[PDB]
Amino acid sequence: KLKLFKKIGIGKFLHSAKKF
């Protein structure tokens, strides 16, 4: 199976890069 639950935790990571 998979842990898509992280699909919602990979935000701050993608964000920090959205501006830096």
Length of the chain: 20
Method in brief: NMR
Return the closest-CA partner of residue 12 out of 3, 1, 20, 4. 20
Token digits for 5? Answer: 């639950």
> What residue type is assigned to position 3 of the chain?
K
Count CA atoms within 13 Å of residue 12 on its CB side.
2
Using CA atoms, how far residue 2 sits from 5, 6, 7, 17, 18, in Å, is 9, 10, 11, 25, 26
